[PDB]
Amino acid sequence: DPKYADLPGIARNEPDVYETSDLPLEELTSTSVEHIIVNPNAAYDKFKDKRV
Amino acid sequence: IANQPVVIDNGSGVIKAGFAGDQIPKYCFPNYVGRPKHVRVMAGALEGDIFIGPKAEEHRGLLSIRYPMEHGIVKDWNDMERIWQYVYSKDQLQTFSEEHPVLLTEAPLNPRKNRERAAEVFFETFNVPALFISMQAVLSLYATGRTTGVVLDSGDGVTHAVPIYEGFAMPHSIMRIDIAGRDVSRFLRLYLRKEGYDFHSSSEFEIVKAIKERACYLSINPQKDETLETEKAQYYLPDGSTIEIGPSRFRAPELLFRPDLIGEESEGIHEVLVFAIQKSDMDLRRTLFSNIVLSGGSTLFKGFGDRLLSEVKKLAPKDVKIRISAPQERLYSTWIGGSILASLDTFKKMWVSKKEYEEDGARSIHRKTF
Amino acid sequence: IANQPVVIDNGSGVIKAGFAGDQIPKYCFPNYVGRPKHVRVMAGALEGDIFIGPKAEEHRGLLSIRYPMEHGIVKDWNDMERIWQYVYSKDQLQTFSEEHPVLLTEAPLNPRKNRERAAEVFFETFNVPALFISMQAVLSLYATGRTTGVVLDSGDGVTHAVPIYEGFAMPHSIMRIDIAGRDVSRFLRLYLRKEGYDFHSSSEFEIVKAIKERACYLSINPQKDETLETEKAQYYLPDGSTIEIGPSRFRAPELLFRPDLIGEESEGIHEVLVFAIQKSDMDLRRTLFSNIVLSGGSTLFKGFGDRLLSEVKKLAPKDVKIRISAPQERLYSTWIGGSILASLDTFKKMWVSKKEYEEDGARSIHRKTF
Amino acid sequence: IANQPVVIDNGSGVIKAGFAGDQIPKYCFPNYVGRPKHVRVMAGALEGDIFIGPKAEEHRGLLSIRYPMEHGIVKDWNDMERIWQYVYSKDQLQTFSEEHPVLLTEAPLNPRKNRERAAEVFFETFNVPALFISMQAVLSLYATGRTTGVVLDSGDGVTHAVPIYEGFAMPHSIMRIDIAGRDVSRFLRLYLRKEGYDFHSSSEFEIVKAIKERACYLSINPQKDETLETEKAQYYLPDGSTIEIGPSRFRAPELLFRPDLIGEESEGIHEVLVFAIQKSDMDLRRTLFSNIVLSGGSTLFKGFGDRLLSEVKKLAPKDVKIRISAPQERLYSTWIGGSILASLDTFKKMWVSKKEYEEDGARSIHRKTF
Ligand SMILES: Nc1ncnc2c1ncn2[C@@H]1O[C@H](COP(=O)(O)OP(=O)(O)O)[C@@H](O)[C@H]1O
Ligand SMILES: Nc1ncnc2c1ncn2[C@@H]1O[C@H](COP(=O)(O)OP(=O)(O)O)[C@@H](O)[C@H]1O
Ligand SMILES: Nc1ncnc2c1ncn2[C@@H]1O[C@H](COP(=O)(O)OP(=O)(O)O)[C@@H](O)[C@H]1O
């Protein structure tokens, strides 16, 4: 307390902070959809030269 | 000038951006412009006073929320300009909006004024050298590597279905109804108000969206569960509170299959798919029923594909092979396919250059968009 | 041209002062006016007929002390003129009011007549060049250096809570009850009268205040400690006698958490904090329950915040971290924050200039309330 | 067993009840439970610990008022039970709770639990032979002759808009905000605190209501009187004091037209009605704009009709004729409609028998909700 001793009513002998106890999606795995892997690299290798 | 093009994937609820070539859209954020409600006092607080992005998600309660794109139609162009600037900002891409061609995305059957004004923005404010607006079905097909298959997607605002047979889009076989995830969230808010848990603030609506995205399932038997008793599973709010949802957790996503609940004569998603298939020829319905690629955000409910197969089998003719495939990252299908398409060599001819826009204008966009 | 501004921090019981850029309020004195009770007879007695400052404390038994600011509302404007002149007198500041800007502090939800008459005083009696009336919660946040927090202060006459998240104040979640230190002192005077001790003199009320500030603590379990007849601790006097307080040293500070003892139906301090947090948004409650900042003089009792934690746990939702951060500078937090606020650069444009007041009038100060 | 059904207008501000067929409600006492605050010492004092209606309106100062129902949702069931028992008591009806059918109104969109518990009280504590729950919109149409219209009621707790056309209600167009007379009185209280007059007791809260009903009006423009800073009309208190108001006898009722003042994003009463009309079918707009019915006590402010007309006129499309039927029985319209409906014989088919509820339960009430 560098500059906080000169004041008359600064309370001490008490803790500053009063805390409490510090204590501590499924549709992708369904059965009616044949889920496909995207794999963009394979699709790019597929559509590599199919011009338009 | 033809650098790595920018694949901007719009969405009425969750925007998706990122450069072409990335296997995952590295920069995704919700599509809402948040601005503070309360009066600022302390000097040195948050600045800008228009929050877009993760800052709008971290300080949800502090700000108001208003969406600029409803049912795939842009309602506020100023907010979308700010959102696109945020896409090019220092927090998402850190690049200039003139050194890259832009690949935008739109839902089909949208009004022509959206396409017009959107390209006006990307060619007047942002001085993009080349823009190419395109659908979403084609992009999900480029992502899955296929060339056929009916693409059905239930995004946040548009639930459409566009069938494609070996790279031949059938424009008149497109069904689009504006009954989507945002409306399911709204119907859920209505049932919660009928429960007691009355969420009404704009920034509080996101909590309803989280509840929908988390504690909601679609029962296979519609009336059997729709008329019986529930179990009232509890849910924890961000307050630290507890909410007993109950019967609304299953009646809220039923809206997607029967829009009579909201009081609107339309069709369910299954009728959208069935009618989109039946509107085509007679020598394609077998290949279309055997190839259904789901996508879109709202096609993630627990017990969704089950009810789709049940409804489709009730509607499709007997002994017809019905298959429903879907990608793994269902939320980033269209963007991945956009990255694939924009990373090709035909994309040099697919776009619309700036000089083309200076010569013709809106007409060139309407011509080269199809 | 401008000089170092003066932070005339008000208070219902203690008025702090000091120039900006300082770290300690060098001139603190009680906010009361003392005038002689008896008759002057001798030649060479005290002169002045009005005594403010340490001189009043030096001659308490000779003066009829009377407070001019009750519950944050100025009741005697002439006495406040004397007090503010004493602030600018040759004993506390030794400067002129025409050469310094003023940072006045007011409690929230005060009547408009206080702001308007304060404007007329500091702009018609004192020819102050610039005045800026600010709140008291924001200043304590400036003093602690934080940006978020629920400032729960308790002055001599007004206890209030203003939840502020990330520098933004919520003017609708501000609770304010007129039950604080002065009223607890009056209630303690009543209990000492019920114990067999008279303190009817107004100058003796200071002795009652000394009893409150020196031998009073907050019991955790109220009635459980009320049933136990304590040791009846003995306290001295500024006379030399001895008073046995007894049970009226723990239930006297219970007025802050139970306004029913004074017969006035209102909320407790814990209910003020909990209701001030519950009246805010949904996504802004864990951070507000965390950053609980205390201020004000009345929050210095023994076991104050411990009972506050217990009561808050009784009202906050289950398993939420609460941090009642009570710094050691709770008495002068608002002044320290006033020094920080006036010592900035934006403060030059935050105030109301004298020319602005001459042009508009009260309207100018009403526009810059926050 | 049935003879002259008992109509009950279970309103959160005042409960209006009488028998069926009565042209006027005979008993309209306020909806609050008055308990004493001061101990009884003298024998022969007032009897009982619960004061309801006429007794809790004369001895108001002695009491502490607890409103049972808030925003059309019951909080303390005990209090509502006591109020209903007061209705069947000797001083009010002298009847038994087993000899008459009961028509108890309810606001729309209330949670299911209110309907369930309300019937549980009327079928368990009271052994009512017949109970029917209605809407507080249809009844106003009955008591006003019309069959097609937009019922815009504003009770003391919940305002809403129900568009009914040719006897058919369009439930999806029902808009409902929970901002009414209570909030206006409470906000008037905050304005008096800003004008220096505090009120914190529950017994003095009705004096705030008294001020509202006797001195509040609505300006046709929000800014033509705002910056004018008009006169301060005095108003006497029940003791003999004096309150001058000025900018609060019009600033407090604008909370209905813009609830942003209370710090809650919602829609104003005009937006409630206009959105309830615009959500209805395209062909039904002109008939709903020409048939607007007012009800509820908050629709009695001075200049309310002119403000409502001008706001709708701003929001309605050009040249559409807007007629707002405003009967003189806005407080008793819903009750008179109840006296009409219960005097018919179709009501016999519309209620629920006791055995119906015993064999079914809550399900029977949700079945006959409309
Ligand atoms: N687990 C989930 N269950 C149900 N809906 C979900 C889930 N996760 C996300 N959603 C929905 O997905 C939507 C996002 O879809 P989106 O990809 O934005 O479509 P678009 O990009 O066409 O707008 C959100 O509106 C949300 O409602
Ligand atoms: N050490 C202490 N312990 C308990 N109460 C105190 C203490 N110091 C001051 N108080 C109370 O606080 C009051 C002063 O609080 P203060 O913060 O000055 O109020 P204000 O700033 O509104 O004048 C005094 O009236 C006294 O009752
Ligand atoms: N003459 C009046 N002018 C303005 N407001 C009134 C008047 N009389 C009553 N009120 C307000 O309207 C309310 C009447 O309650 P009411 O509208 O019947 O509520 P409910 O419909 O729930 O019974 C009162 O509580 C008061 O707030």
Side-chain angles (χ1 to χ4, degrees), chain A residues 1-35 37-50 52, chain B, chain C, chain D:
Chain A
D1 298 332
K3 284 91 170 65
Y4 297 103
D6 297 331
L7 290 165
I10 286 173
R12 292 176 184 86
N13 295 319
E14 297 176 356
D16 297 333
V17 183
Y18 293 151
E19 295 182 352
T20 68
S21 65
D22 195 1
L23 294 175
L25 191 149
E26 294 294 325
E27 181 61 25
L28 294 173
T29 62
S30 71
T31 185
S32 295
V33 283
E34 296 183 355
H35 62 280
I37 294 96
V38 45
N39 194 0
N41 199 0
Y44 184 78
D45 289 330
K46 185 186 293 293
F47 296 150
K48 180 74 173 179
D49 291 330
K50 292 183 181 178
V52 167
Chain B
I1 174 169
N3 302 315
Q4 187 176 7
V6 173
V7 178
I8 289 174
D9 176 80
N10 292 112
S12 60
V14 175
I15 203 167
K16 273 87 75 175
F19 293 98
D22 295 331
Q23 300 181 359
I24 285 171
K26 305 293 291 297
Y27 307 103
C28 299
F29 56 96
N31 199 359
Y32 81 47
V33 171
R35 59 188 65 191
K37 301 178 183 177
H38 311 288
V39 177
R40 69 178 177 89
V41 178
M42 173 180 170
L46 291 177
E47 289 167 346
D49 294 336
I50 300 169
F51 294 151
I52 299 99
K55 289 186 178 181
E57 282 179 345
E58 189 178 4
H59 321 300
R60 284 182 184 172
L62 180 142
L63 48 91
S64 70
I65 287 169
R66 53 181 295 164
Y67 290 95
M69 185 172 179
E70 294 185 356
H71 300 293
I73 300 167
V74 172
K75 298 292 190 290
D76 292 334
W77 290 99
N78 290 318
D79 290 333
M80 286 302 285
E81 288 189 357
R82 290 173 182 171
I83 287 167
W84 289 340
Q85 283 176 354
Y86 181 68
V87 171
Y88 291 105
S89 176
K90 297 179 182 179
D91 290 345
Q92 306 300 319
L93 295 177
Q94 294 180 358
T95 59
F96 296 159
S97 68
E98 299 183 354
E99 293 182 355
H100 300 286
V102 179
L103 171 63
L104 202 68
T105 61
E106 285 185 352
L109 298 175
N110 280 323
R112 288 176 179 174
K113 294 180 181 179
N114 292 114
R115 190 178 300 272
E116 284 171 349
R117 183 65 174 167
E120 287 183 354
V121 167
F122 275 95
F123 277 106
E124 286 168 351
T125 65
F126 308 99
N127 292 113
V128 171
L131 175 64
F132 172 65
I133 307 166
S134 67
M135 302 303 107
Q136 299 178 356
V138 188
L139 270 65
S140 63
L141 288 182
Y142 285 119
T144 60
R146 298 184 178 181
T147 49
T148 74
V150 177
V151 172
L152 183 274
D153 50 351
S154 294
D156 184 71
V158 176
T159 61
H160 61 272
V162 176
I164 288 171
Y165 183 78
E166 289 192 355
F168 281 101
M170 295 185 281
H172 306 101
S173 295
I174 294 174
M175 286 295 291
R176 171 190 190 270
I177 305 177
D178 303 336
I179 184 69
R182 182 180 290 165
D183 205 355
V184 180
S185 171
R186 190 173 298 169
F187 182 74
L188 197 151
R189 186 179 72 191
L190 180 62
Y191 271 176
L192 289 182
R193 189 166 66 186
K194 285 185 180 180
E195 288 289 333
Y197 298 140
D198 49 356
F199 298 114
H200 65 283
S201 171
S202 66
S203 64
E204 197 178 4
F205 183 74
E206 297 291 325
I207 297 171
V208 179
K209 281 171 92 287
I211 292 172
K212 179 180 94 274
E213 290 171 354
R214 185 171 171 87
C216 284
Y217 71 103
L218 275 173
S219 69
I220 299 167
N221 295 317
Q223 298 176 357
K224 303 284 102 174
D225 286 333
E226 195 266 331
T227 59
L228 282 175
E229 186 64 28
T230 184
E231 295 183 355
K232 287 187 178 179
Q234 291 184 354
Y235 182 70
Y236 291 104
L237 293 173
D239 192 358
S241 301
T242 300
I243 269 182
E244 293 180 351
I245 297 168
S248 63
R249 63 183 295 159
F250 71 55
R251 290 180 184 177
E254 290 288 327
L255 174 61
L256 292 177
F257 285 151
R258 46 179 294 159
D260 290 330
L261 300 176
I262 203 65
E264 184 180 3
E265 56 269 19
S266 294
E267 291 87 3
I269 303 175
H270 62 282
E271 293 174 353
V272 166
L273 186 147
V274 167
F275 291 165
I277 290 172
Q278 289 183 357
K279 281 182 182 179
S280 67
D281 291 333
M282 295 293 294
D283 296 332
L284 297 177
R285 301 180 182 179
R286 294 184 68 86
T287 60
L288 295 187
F289 278 118
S290 65
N291 291 110
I292 292 170
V293 180
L294 298 179
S295 58
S298 300
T299 50
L300 282 162
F301 285 107
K302 292 183 182 182
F304 173 73
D306 296 327
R307 188 162 165 83
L308 268 186
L309 279 180
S310 68
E311 288 287 327
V312 167
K313 282 182 179 176
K314 292 178 185 68
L315 292 178
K318 289 184 178 180
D319 293 332
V320 175
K321 184 176 181 180
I322 302 171
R323 289 179 66 251
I324 291 176
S325 66
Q328 287 177 351
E329 291 189 358
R330 186 175 283 112
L331 293 174
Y332 314 121
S333 309
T334 72
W335 187 81
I336 280 171
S339 179
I340 293 168
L341 173 64
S343 62
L344 299 184
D345 289 334
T346 71
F347 195 73
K348 294 178 175 64
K349 293 183 182 179
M350 286 287 177
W351 57 59
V352 173
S353 73
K354 187 172 182 181
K355 187 174 89 275
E356 179 72 27
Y357 182 80
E358 290 187 355
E359 290 182 353
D360 291 330
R363 294 185 292 113
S364 64
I365 309 153
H366 298 298
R367 286 186 297 112
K368 291 192 77 68
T369 188
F370 280 100
Chain C
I1 189 166
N3 299 112
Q4 193 170 3
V6 179
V7 181
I8 300 171
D9 188 2
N10 275 321
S12 58
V14 175
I15 168 171
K16 278 83 71 176
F19 297 103
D22 298 330
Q23 297 179 358
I24 303 166
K26 306 296 286 184
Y27 300 100
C28 300
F29 63 97
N31 201 3
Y32 68 74
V33 171
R35 56 193 64 190
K37 300 178 183 178
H38 308 294
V39 188
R40 186 181 295 116
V41 174
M42 196 181 174
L46 293 179
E47 185 70 29
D49 293 332
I50 292 171
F51 295 98
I52 316 104
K55 288 185 181 180
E57 292 175 352
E58 187 179 1
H59 313 296
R60 290 187 181 93
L62 192 149
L63 304 176
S64 72
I65 290 168
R66 57 177 296 161
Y67 294 95
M69 192 170 179
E70 291 183 354
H71 300 290
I73 297 171
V74 167
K75 300 296 192 295
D76 291 334
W77 288 103
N78 291 318
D79 293 329
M80 287 302 285
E81 286 183 353
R82 268 78 166 177
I83 291 165
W84 285 338
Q85 283 178 353
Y86 183 81
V87 173
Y88 290 110
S89 176
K90 292 181 180 180
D91 290 345
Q92 302 298 108
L93 289 177
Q94 302 175 357
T95 62
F96 292 160
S97 68
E98 299 178 353
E99 294 178 354
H100 292 281
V102 178
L103 172 54
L104 194 70
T105 60
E106 283 185 352
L109 300 178
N110 277 323
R112 290 182 184 177
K113 290 182 181 180
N114 283 321
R115 300 174 65 91
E116 297 174 355
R117 186 63 177 167
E120 287 187 355
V121 168
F122 284 96
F123 281 111
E124 287 181 353
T125 64
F126 300 97
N127 293 319
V128 172
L131 168 62
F132 172 69
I133 297 169
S134 69
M135 288 297 108
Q136 295 184 356
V138 186
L139 271 68
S140 71
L141 281 181
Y142 279 121
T144 58
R146 293 184 180 184
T147 59
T148 76
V150 174
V151 177
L152 189 269
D153 59 349
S154 293
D156 179 67
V158 167
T159 60
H160 61 268
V162 178
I164 295 167
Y165 179 73
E166 288 171 350
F168 290 8
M170 296 179 278
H172 295 92
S173 300
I174 295 173
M175 296 297 293
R176 177 188 189 269
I177 315 177
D178 300 337
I179 178 74
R182 179 181 293 174
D183 206 355
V184 179
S185 176
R186 186 177 296 113
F187 183 74
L188 188 142
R189 181 176 72 188
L190 182 61
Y191 270 169
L192 292 180
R193 190 170 67 186
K194 285 185 183 180
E195 288 292 327
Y197 300 98
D198 51 350
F199 292 100
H200 60 280
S201 178
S202 75
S203 67
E204 204 177 2
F205 190 76
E206 299 291 327
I207 302 165
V208 180
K209 278 168 90 285
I211 295 170
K212 180 174 70 70
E213 293 176 357
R214 188 173 170 91
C216 290
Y217 67 99
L218 274 170
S219 67
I220 296 170
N221 289 320
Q223 293 180 356
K224 307 288 104 176
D225 292 326
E226 177 65 27
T227 57
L228 288 175
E229 188 173 2
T230 184
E231 291 181 352
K232 296 183 179 178
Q234 294 183 358
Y235 174 61
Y236 283 108
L237 276 178
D239 176 1
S241 298
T242 295
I243 300 174
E244 292 182 353
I245 301 167
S248 66
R249 70 188 178 95
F250 76 52
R251 61 177 178 182
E254 286 288 327
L255 180 62
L256 294 174
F257 296 152
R258 287 183 184 177
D260 294 330
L261 299 173
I262 203 67
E264 175 173 359
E265 59 175 2
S266 294
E267 296 89 5
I269 276 179
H270 66 276
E271 290 182 354
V272 162
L273 185 144
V274 174
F275 285 168
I277 290 172
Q278 288 182 357
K279 280 185 179 179
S280 62
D281 287 320
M282 283 290 290
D283 285 331
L284 305 180
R285 290 179 187 174
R286 294 178 72 92
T287 60
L288 289 185
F289 273 117
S290 70
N291 285 321
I292 287 175
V293 173
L294 294 182
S295 178
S298 299
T299 59
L300 292 176
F301 285 154
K302 293 180 183 177
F304 172 73
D306 297 336
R307 180 171 172 87
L308 189 59
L309 277 178
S310 68
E311 293 289 328
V312 169
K313 282 183 179 178
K314 290 180 184 179
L315 291 177
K318 294 181 181 179
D319 298 334
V320 184
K321 186 175 182 179
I322 308 160
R323 295 181 64 249
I324 300 173
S325 68
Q328 296 182 358
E329 302 165 354
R330 281 177 280 180
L331 279 169
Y332 312 102
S333 296
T334 57
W335 188 80
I336 291 171
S339 177
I340 296 171
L341 178 62
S343 67
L344 289 179
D345 292 329
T346 61
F347 183 74
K348 295 181 178 67
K349 296 183 73 173
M350 281 187 176
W351 58 66
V352 175
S353 73
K354 184 175 182 178
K355 186 173 90 274
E356 175 68 30
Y357 182 76
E358 286 185 350
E359 289 177 356
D360 292 328
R363 184 72 65 86
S364 65
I365 281 179
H366 288 297
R367 286 184 290 108
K368 298 182 179 67
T369 181
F370 283 173
Chain D
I1 176 166
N3 201 7
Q4 293 301 111
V6 176
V7 175
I8 288 174
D9 192 81
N10 190 3
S12 63
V14 55
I15 176 165
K16 303 167 282 291
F19 296 107
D22 300 333
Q23 188 179 1
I24 173 169
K26 299 296 181 185
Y27 312 105
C28 297
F29 61 97
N31 187 6
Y32 61 79
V33 174
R35 293 187 181 94
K37 296 172 66 68
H38 314 291
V39 293
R40 72 178 71 192
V41 179
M42 170 178 168
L46 282 188
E47 300 170 350
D49 292 333
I50 294 161
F51 289 143
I52 307 298
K55 291 185 74 174
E57 203 168 5
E58 187 180 5
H59 318 299
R60 189 190 302 116
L62 185 151
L63 302 174
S64 70
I65 284 172
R66 178 176 304 277
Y67 286 100
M69 197 168 178
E70 185 175 5
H71 295 290
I73 291 172
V74 172
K75 300 296 180 291
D76 282 337
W77 289 99
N78 305 312
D79 284 333
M80 290 299 284
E81 286 167 353
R82 289 161 185 172
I83 291 168
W84 289 340
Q85 286 169 0
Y86 185 77
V87 173
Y88 296 107
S89 182
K90 183 178 179 180
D91 290 345
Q92 299 300 312
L93 287 174
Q94 302 93 16
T95 65
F96 294 153
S97 74
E98 302 177 356
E99 304 187 0
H100 309 282
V102 169
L103 170 60
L104 178 134
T105 70
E106 187 191 5
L109 282 167
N110 281 132
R112 287 182 175 90
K113 290 178 283 186
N114 294 111
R115 307 177 63 86
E116 298 180 353
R117 295 288 296 159
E120 285 190 357
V121 171
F122 277 97
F123 277 158
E124 295 292 326
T125 65
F126 304 104
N127 305 321
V128 175
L131 174 63
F132 178 69
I133 296 172
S134 172
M135 287 297 108
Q136 292 178 359
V138 180
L139 269 58
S140 72
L141 289 171
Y142 274 148
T144 48
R146 301 174 180 270
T147 66
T148 78
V150 173
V151 179
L152 188 270
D153 51 348
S154 290
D156 195 71
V158 165
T159 81
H160 48 273
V162 175
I164 297 173
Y165 180 71
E166 293 292 329
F168 290 176
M170 301 174 278
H172 295 95
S173 291
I174 287 173
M175 291 297 292
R176 177 188 188 271
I177 57 168
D178 307 335
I179 289 157
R182 289 283 190 87
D183 295 333
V184 186
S185 173
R186 182 168 293 156
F187 190 57
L188 196 153
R189 184 170 71 185
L190 264 72
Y191 262 104
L192 296 175
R193 291 179 67 193
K194 282 182 179 180
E195 292 185 356
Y197 300 150
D198 64 340
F199 294 100
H200 49 275
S201 173
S202 73
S203 69
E204 65 192 357
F205 181 77
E206 276 79 12
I207 299 171
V208 183
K209 273 174 63 180
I211 291 170
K212 177 169 75 75
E213 297 177 357
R214 286 181 185 86
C216 287
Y217 70 99
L218 275 169
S219 71
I220 316 103
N221 285 316
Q223 290 187 359
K224 293 300 287 183
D225 298 336
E226 179 267 333
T227 185
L228 200 286
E229 299 174 355
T230 68
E231 61 176 359
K232 295 188 182 294
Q234 287 181 350
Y235 171 64
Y236 292 102
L237 283 178
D239 62 347
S241 300
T242 294
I243 285 179
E244 70 273 11
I245 302 165
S248 300
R249 51 177 171 166
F250 63 93
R251 186 66 58 84
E254 282 192 353
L255 181 269
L256 291 89
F257 289 94
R258 53 189 308 267
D260 307 332
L261 300 178
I262 207 66
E264 179 182 4
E265 80 270 16
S266 291
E267 302 90 2
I269 174 173
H270 71 296
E271 294 173 356
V272 163
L273 179 140
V274 169
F275 288 165
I277 291 175
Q278 286 180 352
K279 280 182 181 177
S280 58
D281 292 329
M282 187 77 71
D283 290 330
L284 294 174
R285 272 89 189 272
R286 286 179 186 268
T287 48
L288 294 176
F289 279 109
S290 70
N291 296 318
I292 290 173
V293 190
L294 298 177
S295 171
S298 301
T299 54
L300 287 162
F301 285 155
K302 298 177 181 64
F304 178 70
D306 290 328
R307 274 293 302 275
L308 191 64
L309 267 184
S310 61
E311 293 294 326
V312 173
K313 186 173 181 179
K314 286 182 180 294
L315 285 175
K318 283 184 92 289
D319 308 329
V320 177
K321 183 173 181 64
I322 301 163
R323 292 188 69 252
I324 300 170
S325 67
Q328 297 179 357
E329 299 169 346
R330 287 195 286 279
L331 273 174
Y332 316 102
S333 296
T334 66
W335 189 84
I336 291 170
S339 178
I340 289 159
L341 186 61
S343 69
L344 300 177
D345 305 331
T346 62
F347 181 70
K348 299 183 181 179
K349 306 179 294 184
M350 291 192 285
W351 60 64
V352 172
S353 80
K354 186 177 180 180
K355 66 176 185 178
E356 175 73 29
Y357 179 74
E358 289 161 353
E359 293 165 352
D360 301 327
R363 194 62 60 90
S364 64
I365 309 148
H366 305 300
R367 280 168 63 250
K368 296 182 179 67
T369 184
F370 279 174

